[PDB]
Symmetry: C2
Subunit: 502 residues, 2 copies
Amino acid sequence: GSHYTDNRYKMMECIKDAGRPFYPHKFKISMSLPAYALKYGNVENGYIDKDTTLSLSGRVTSIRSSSSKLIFYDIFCEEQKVQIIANIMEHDISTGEFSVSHSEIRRGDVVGFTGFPGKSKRGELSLFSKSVVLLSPCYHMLPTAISGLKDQEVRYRQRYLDLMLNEESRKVFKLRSRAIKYIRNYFDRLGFLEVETPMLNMIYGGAAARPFITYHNELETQLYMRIAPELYLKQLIVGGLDKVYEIGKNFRNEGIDLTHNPEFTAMEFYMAYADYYDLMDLTEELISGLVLEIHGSLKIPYHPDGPEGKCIEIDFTTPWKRFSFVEEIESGLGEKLKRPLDSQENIDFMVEMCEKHEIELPHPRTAAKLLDKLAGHFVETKCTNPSFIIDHPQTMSPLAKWHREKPEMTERFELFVLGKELCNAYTELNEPLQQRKFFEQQADAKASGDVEACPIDETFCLALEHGLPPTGGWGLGIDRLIMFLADKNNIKEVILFPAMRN
Amino acid sequence: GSHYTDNRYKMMECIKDAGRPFYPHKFKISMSLPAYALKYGNVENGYIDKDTTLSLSGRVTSIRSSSSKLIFYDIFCEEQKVQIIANIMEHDISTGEFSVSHSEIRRGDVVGFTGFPGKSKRGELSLFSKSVVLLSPCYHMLPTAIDQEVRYRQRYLDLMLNEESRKVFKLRSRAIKYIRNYFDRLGFLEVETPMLNMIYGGAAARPFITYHNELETQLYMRIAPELYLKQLIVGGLDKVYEIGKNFRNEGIDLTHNPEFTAMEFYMAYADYYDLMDLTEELISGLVLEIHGSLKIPYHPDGPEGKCIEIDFTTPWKRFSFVEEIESGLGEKLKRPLDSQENIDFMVEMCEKHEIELPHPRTAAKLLDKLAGHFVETKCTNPSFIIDHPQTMSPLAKWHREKPEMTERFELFVLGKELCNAYTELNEPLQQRKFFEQQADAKASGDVEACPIDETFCLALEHGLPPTGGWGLGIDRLIMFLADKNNIKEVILFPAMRNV
Ligand SMILES: Nc1ncnc2c1ncn2[C@@H]1O[C@H](CO)[C@@H](O)[C@H]1O
Ligand SMILES: Nc1ncnc2c1ncn2[C@@H]1O[C@H](CO)[C@@H](O)[C@H]1O
Ligand SMILES: N[C@@H](CCCC[NH3+])C(=O)O
Ligand SMILES: N[C@@H](CCCC[NH3+])C(=O)O
Ligand code: NA
């Protein structure tokens, strides 16, 4: 273990001081291993083309010697295995003695080979080699599969080992790229403009979340990492860009669990002249289209307790169920909330309902945070298949436009799948007096200890005074989307280098 | 100004109290204004189709009340202007008296109209309207055209009034699309790596510091994704790229924003010679795609000032880092380059040639000051500065021929850095040594030196294939492609001095 690494360093010093190849700068491959298998994988058993000399490279996954004169390697690269057959009779002595050249190679090394293409008589796609070059040794004894690792935290703390040994991990990150490409294409075809807005701002906003705080030395100002791009994106709609989207990181200074990482990939878009009814239809079309693209149908498998557990089916057939926020809470309680929803009477009532139903109280005990706890208990738990929770109270939705029919509510929805939030969207509040009033209420909540409440943003109120058209905006948690598409129940599976405790 | 805003708020309260339309939730347009122009733009002068009623919407850019009976509007939306002709004889009185309905509208308002399509007798694409609805008022008197700091602090005003600024950000998207497509077609995988970490590295920069409360852990924002991306090549992904923000806690100027958009890629089995060829092919292709030529204009002092020509014709000029410094000095640096003797000699040379001294006076920072004076100033056209000393390139592999150098290049255009790339150091003993020298420099007062990254050293012990890696400043690229001399012109919401 420790001896192996020590001895490997001693081998490499011996190599270097014997004048032999020590970390060559450039190895010119003739073709990739996938290209090699495509070209030669169908030749007849025993075929060899001695008129063609080719250079290949990969990581050694197997070494065996059938005799003093014959060594078999497997190398692996870009998802393809190729066997190397090294016969002493073909060895190029200008590269050194056969036994010396091969004594330097270990399983796990990155190596190059040169030789003739073909297939062993037993039918294995092979390179019949004349030389071997150690390109980058592995100083550690590697397992053959991710089951041979010390802990399964190793997969996350040393992701290169997961990627090296586990095809399923590599497939996840290819699917991640494929899904994001689909999303960009969907919005590009609709005429959207992709933009980038600041991740560092003098004032945070646009979501219910605690920020990271930092400092810019030369400007002598504190800054926040963005919890959401919403307030900048809406200024672009004031500016006339009509259809914009942004895909990138949000940063939320909060706990880590199966569906939360402190930095995560999200998307928002803003579409002038849409309302939240339009956005519900678009969400159904976009997500069902993507599910269909990946899976071939709208009913897809999910293993909620890991792949050693049961398999359930998530049904993305549209249209999806709607749950109205307050009505579904009241159905769960068997009685109505007090009105106004943000009155002291209803706040006291909701505290007593949380205690009655053994729901842990938020702090501070604002109407918005109490409504959120009740929704999490009574409504989010009903959302197995994709389901919209709609018409959230204004008191918990400071940037959402008042509902055109329902007093105290907003034109808002959240999309939930398997009880977890995927999307958040609304008809955008574009009336500046109300916007300032709700910002003031947020700032009061922040001063009272609500770390997820946001300060007043004067620059944003001034932007609204220049005229935000009727607009619909929308956000999606891309990592959570990948969790469902790839059938992973831990967000650490879909993020290359996730945050780890300790 | 102040009175106008307050009076507009009073108008809106009067509208609300009269039960008149107050911020309607949904206006259903019949078609976009560009679609409207495409459909009716070629009809004969004076054409009107009173059998077709359409709804259109935009921002009011002009109001001409020619008479008590007739009002002309221009509305603007999605880059298309349409004239609205509002005749009292067509007014739908169920929406209010004609004078009342139009009294509520001002230039700058977002409005909807419904009416008949056609063209005025004078030949203007028009809507002959029957109604008007105030969708979202503007509470401020707007100029007719673009401090000019207002363009940066209130970017919506720049976008609203200045087509040139909208064009810049469409070009920015077009260029990034071209870049993604170039690497996608080569079989690259786009990845995302952490912007928040317990350590910082991969470049020479002071980091931003933050804190995760639940984990009770101080964190740094990334100054570069380099060390994570190389771990993915150890992992076998072979060809990866990332496009996104870096964060560097340093001064702002015409080419520096504290957050900026960068791209890095890592290609197993490439060396820096391969990366030079790829850089030429990628960038010259993009320039050709946007401009139709490899020779493009640039205005270093603004669009009314002098214009120069940047020539992207291949192959580009190479400058060897040390040789060019020595040609400028007319004498040779002392060896080893990181000896105390050469540090003192480079200090003497800076004083001789009136170059401002770095702090601290490390060999790497002195060499950088000398290169900036004697070499970077020669790079008007795209030019590669190559073979940087190891002492300033702790992650670049030793040069296969030149002692003390590395297989590194930087791409400079108009004296400004655009790319940084090298054959990657994949030998772990040397890597630790150079990390230790960096840690010593940081302990000696170099705030741009990085701590030792043990997780990266351990990753190298698992075998990084020979690899070439590369970075590009996207914002600076857009500056040249779009002909802007200030990075604030290519970033939607740039950092501004707080005063
Ligand atoms: N900490 C988090 N980690 C991952 N995804 C999150 C987190 N918080 C919220 N989300 C998702 O991102 C969206 C907001 O950016 C939410 O609607 C949800 O889907
Ligand atoms: N502060 C900065 N602002 C903008 N671009 C930068 C900054 N620092 C470096 N760059 C560019 O980004 C690359 C590194 O990410 C550099 O090669 C350079 O082109
Ligand atoms: N900013 C929201 C998403 C957009 C909501 C609609 N404007 C969030 O972080 O969840
Ligand atoms: N990390 C470098 C770019 C890549 C250099 C090659 N590995 C920078 O920030 O300049
Ligand atoms: Na359907």
